[PDB]
Amino acid sequence: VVANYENASMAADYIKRVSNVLPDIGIICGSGLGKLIEEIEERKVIPYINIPNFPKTTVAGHVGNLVLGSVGGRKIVAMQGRLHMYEGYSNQEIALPIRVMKLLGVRVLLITNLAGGINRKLKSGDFVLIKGHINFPGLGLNNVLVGPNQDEFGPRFPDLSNAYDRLLQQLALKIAQENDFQDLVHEGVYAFNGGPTYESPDESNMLLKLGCDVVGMSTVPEVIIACHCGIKVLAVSLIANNSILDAENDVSINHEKVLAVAEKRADLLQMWFKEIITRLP
Amino acid sequence: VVANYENASMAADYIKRVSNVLPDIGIICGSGLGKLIEEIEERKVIPYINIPNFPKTTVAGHVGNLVLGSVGGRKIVAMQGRLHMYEGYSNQEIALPIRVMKLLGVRVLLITNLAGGINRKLKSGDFVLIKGHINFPGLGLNNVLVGPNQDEFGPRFPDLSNAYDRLLQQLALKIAQENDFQDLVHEGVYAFNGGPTYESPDESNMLLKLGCDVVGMSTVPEVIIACHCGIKVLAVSLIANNSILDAENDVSINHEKVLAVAEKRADLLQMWFKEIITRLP
Amino acid sequence: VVANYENASMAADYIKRVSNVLPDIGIICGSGLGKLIEEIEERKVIPYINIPNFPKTTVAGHVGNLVLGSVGGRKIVAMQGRLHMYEGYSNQEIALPIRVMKLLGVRVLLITNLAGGINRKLKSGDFVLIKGHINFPGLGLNNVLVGPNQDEFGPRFPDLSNAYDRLLQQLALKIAQENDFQDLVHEGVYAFNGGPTYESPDESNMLLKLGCDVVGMSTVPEVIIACHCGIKVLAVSLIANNSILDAENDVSINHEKVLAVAEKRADLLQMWFKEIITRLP
Ligand SMILES: CC(=O)c1ccc(N)cc1O
Ligand SMILES: CC(=O)c1ccc(N)cc1O
Ligand SMILES: CC(=O)c1ccc(N)cc1O
Numbered sequence: 085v086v087a088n089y090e091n092a093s094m095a096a097d098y099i100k101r102v103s104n105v106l107p108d109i110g111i112i113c114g115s116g117l118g119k120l121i122e123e124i125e126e127r128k129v130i131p132y133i134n135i136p137n138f139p140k141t142t143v144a145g146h147v148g149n150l151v152l153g154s155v156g157g158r159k160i161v162a163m164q165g166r167l168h169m170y171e172g173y174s175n176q177e178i179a180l181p182i183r184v185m186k187l188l189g190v191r192v193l194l195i196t197n198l199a200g201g202i203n204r205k206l207k208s209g210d211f212v213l214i215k216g217h218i219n220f221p222g223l224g225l226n227n228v229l230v231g232p233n234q235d236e237f238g239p240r241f242p243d244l245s246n247a248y249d250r251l252l253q254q255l256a257l258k259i260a261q262e263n264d265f266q267d268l269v270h271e272g273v274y275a276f277n278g279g280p281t282y283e284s285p286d287e288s289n290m291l292l293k294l295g296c297d298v299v300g301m302s303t304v305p306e307v308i309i310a311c312h313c314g315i316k317v318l319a320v321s322l323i324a325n326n327s328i329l330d331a332e333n334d335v336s337i338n339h340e341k342v343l344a345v346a347e348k349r350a351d352l353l354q355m356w357f358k359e360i361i362t363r364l365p
Numbered sequence: 366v367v368a369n370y371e372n373a374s375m376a377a378d379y380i381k382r383v384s385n386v387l388p389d390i391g392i393i394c395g396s397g398l399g400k401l402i403e404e405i406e407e408r409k410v411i412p413y414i415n416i417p418n419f420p421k422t423t424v425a426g427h428v429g430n431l432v433l434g435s436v437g438g439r440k441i442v443a444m445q446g447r448l449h450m451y452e453g454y455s456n457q458e459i460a461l462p463i464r465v466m467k468l469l470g471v472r473v474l475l476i477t478n479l480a481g482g483i484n485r486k487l488k489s490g491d492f493v494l495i496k497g498h499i500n501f502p503g504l505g506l507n508n509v510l511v512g513p514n515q516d517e518f519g520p521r522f523p524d525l526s527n528a529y530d531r532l533l534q535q536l537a538l539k540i541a542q543e544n545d546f547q548d549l550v551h552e553g554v555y556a557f558n559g560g561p562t563y564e565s566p567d568e569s570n571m572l573l574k575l576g577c578d579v580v581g582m583s584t585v586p587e588v589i590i591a592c593h594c595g596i597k598v599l600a601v602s603l604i605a606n607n608s609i610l611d612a613e614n615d616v617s618i619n620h621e622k623v624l625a626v627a628e629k630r631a632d633l634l635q636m637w638f639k640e641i642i643t644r645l646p
Numbered sequence: 647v648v649a650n651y652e653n654a655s656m657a658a659d660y661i662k663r664v665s666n667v668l669p670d671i672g673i674i675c676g677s678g679l680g681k682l683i684e685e686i687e688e689r690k691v692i693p694y695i696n697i698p699n700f701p702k703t704t705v706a707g708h709v710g711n712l713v714l715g716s717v718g719g720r721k722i723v724a725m726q727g728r729l730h731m732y733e734g735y736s737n738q739e740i741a742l743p744i745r746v747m748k749l750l751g752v753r754v755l756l757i758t759n760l761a762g763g764i765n766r767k768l769k770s771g772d773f774v775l776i777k778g779h780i781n782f783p784g785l786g787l788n789n790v791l792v793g794p795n796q797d798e799f800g801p802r803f804p805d806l807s808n809a810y811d812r813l814l815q816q817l818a819l820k821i822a823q824e825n826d827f828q829d830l831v832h833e834g835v836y837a838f839n840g841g842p843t844y845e846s847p848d849e850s851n852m853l854l855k856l857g858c859d860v861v862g863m864s865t866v867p868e869v870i871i872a873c874h875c876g877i878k879v880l881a882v883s884l885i886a887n888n889s890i891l892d893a894e895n896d897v898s899i900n901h902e903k904v905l906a907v908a909e910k911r912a913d914l915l916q917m918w919f920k921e922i923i924t925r926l927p
Contacts, residue, residue, distance in 0.1 A: 280789065
């Protein structure tokens with residue numbers, strides 16, 4: 085199934101009938117960082133499998149819902165269970181849920197992930213406002229837009245120089261200052277590693293030479309589809325570990341350690357993003 | 366359809382019956398740089414869709430013809446509308462038209478493109494004679510030769526160290542000197558970005574560290590297929606913008622700006638390549 | 647055919663019936679470096695085509711056998727004819743023979759290849775003990791583990807920091823010292839170029855900046871599948887040429903030159919690996 089105009093419209097039709105909500109904000113939350121979704125007010129939970137033309141996710145398993153409702157007086161739609169390209173999803177499967185968000189009325193997309201720190205100023209538990217990216221799959225002919233262009237959504241050759249909105253980064257920092265946790269908040273460039281193996285010690289050393297600040301396995305595909313169709317983006321990484329230090333000390337990273345950092349910071353991240361949503365222009 | 370000996374021979378059979386021309390020069394022109402094709406003498410225009418085993422190009426649309434005839438007393442074949450890998454064409458679809466050129470008698474292939482400048486000496490409107498390349502898709506398991514080797518055309522493991530003929534670069538520079546536009550003519554290394562998103566500001570900064578002089582989304586696939594089967598190559602980039610300056614000044618690039626630079630330099634490029642064809646040993 | 651538990655078990659069932667050998671060591675030998683396989687004692691040769699669920703290899707052709715028997719008192723299984731991803735094999739086709747090795751009882755995998763030297767200390771004929779890697783296909787969304795995870799074999803997100811066993815590297819060096827050829831033995835980081843074109847002169851210059859010591863077109867896919875399912879690895883590169891010197895002197899590399907270096911060092915490599923097998927804890 086192609087992520088074209090007609091197919092995205094059929095999905096949006098279904099969601100409009102079932103939910104009644106006209107959202108103008110979208111959210112995609114990282115692993116263990118979804119508690120906010122469970123506090124959406126007057127909410128409607130829609131399993132992906134029930135939505136016409138949504139990608140099939142039963143081989144990977146685990147939760148996969150679209151959730152609609154209100155936060156801080158604002159109307160939102162959330163993906164509960166994001167799709168990752170290391171599972172083998174095609175470009176068309178990744179793009180269709182974002183293009184459905186567009187047809188529902190979304191103008192701002194908020195994204196979180198966990199990632200490895202490369203910059204030596206970054207420690208476990210820090211937050212990074214993403215200001216740019218290095219897309220290794222894109223350079224290497226696996227860009228999420230490889231394929232025919234869907235002209236109704238955007239141009240054949242997008243410019244990504246303003247993909248990460250500057251004013252949204254400033255608002256996120258202002259709220260951190262108001263609550264006295266700005267000592268945790270950095271900015272930086274996100275490198276996309278297709279995955280699912282963590283960056284090796286020698287890959288980490290290479291990434292430091294190349295000017296990467298953080299590295300992870302998500303986010304860049306969704307950002308590019310959102311930028312293509314004119315949706316503004318704020319993206320924030322929660323640092324699980326510093327991979328350069330770990331290489332010097334022969335320390336390993338694993339998913340259990342990642343989820344423990346998520347649980348340690350989840351409630352503060354929930355509070356932060358609730359206020360961002362409330363304050364959005 | 367595989368780009369093998371039998372399939373390429375069937376296409377060449379058709380072209381020989383229809384055209385009568387035995388070319389020994391091939392040309393592939395970049396976007397907005399095709400005016401020379403319209404001045405080919407005693408010419409024959411063959412739509413791709415009419416040629417047995419040629420790749421289907423109707424999803425992308427736009428012009429797609431093979432054109433045969435004479436320039437400067439020399440017999441040539443031109444691709445009018447090149448195939449780009451960001452459209453989703455397979456390795457086999459890209460390679461078959463070049464291998465048909467080989468079976469028709471082509472010994473020299475001339476290529477132009479538009480590209481972004483990375484080297485700080487490059488400005489909008491400059492020309493770069495390509496002397497080498499950095500193939501990010503190839504390093505990342507998307508080389509145009511991934512697949513079974515077609516032994517009749519060339520070896521399993523090609524060496525690309527002489528892919529860009531030195532004497533053809535010297536002839537192109539000599540002609541620029543004769544017409545007093547050598548101040549526009551540089552040499553450099555071409556980085557292949559699969560695309561279709563332009564290099565981001567942070568990707569551009571990385572490319573400068575890596576020794577790239579220019580970056581674009583074409584040319585390297587055709588060069589590798591030509592080198593594999595023993596065809597000599599001259600490739601020239603027309604610089605649309607300097608992406609490093611643009612990153613420092615928050616300036617964007619778009620296809621309208623690219624085509625305006627093409628129109629500004631098209632007639633000089635036409636004059637240049639006509640004389641190169643005329644002078645080829 | 648997926649490289650899952652049930653399919654690998656069906657292949658292992660067949661091999662157990664035919665061979666009688668319960669191996670705990672696996673070997674994969676590089677081009678021209680397979681003489682040891684022909685001296686396996688009380689051996690059984692099994693063509694891939696006869697084994698249920700093994701990948702089809704007839705398009706590429708050439709030898710493809712599984713060989714089981716005894717070396718130095720130890721029970722081994724060898725792949726005679728390795729699978730290379732530049733042939734177009736899928737992730738599932740590469741992984742299934744390694745996962746069959748696991749089900750047969752393999753705990754240690756020994757690997758050789760030929761490769762190009764990047765570090766200026768490396769000459770034709772030197773050996774490099776691999777201590778880490780830089781996986782350009784993995785960064786670029788062509789990792790051998792892209793797809794659903796096969797949970798019975800290993801975790802969704804593997805850590806590769808101990809993929810190359812330190813004690814096996816120490817044993818290999820000790821044996822070289824015992825036989826007075828330690829002057830040939832280096833250690834280093836292996837870059838994976840998907841291939842099948844050799845690194846270009848300008849790609850070689852880039853690899854030196856990035857901290858790569860050697861570059862080749864194999865090994866990293868098998869290492870990652872072995873590490874995923876808990877098999878220890880020793881991997882050794884035989885240097886065919888120094889690609890940085892060759893770029894400075896406009897010297898080419900080709901497969902004939904590669905095979906001549908293999909023949910020059912084959913007997914010493916056979917002696918070395920026989921003793922390693924004999925001495926394995
Ligand atoms: C969640 C995720 O993708 C991730 C987390 C930690 C890390 N060092 C690298 C990663 O890619
Ligand atoms: C024509 C083309 O591919 C191209 C043009 C300008 C640029 N900065 C990058 C590009 O890739
Ligand atoms: C056997 C092989 O893959 C190989 C050999 C020599 C070389 N300079 C590069 C290579 O990739």
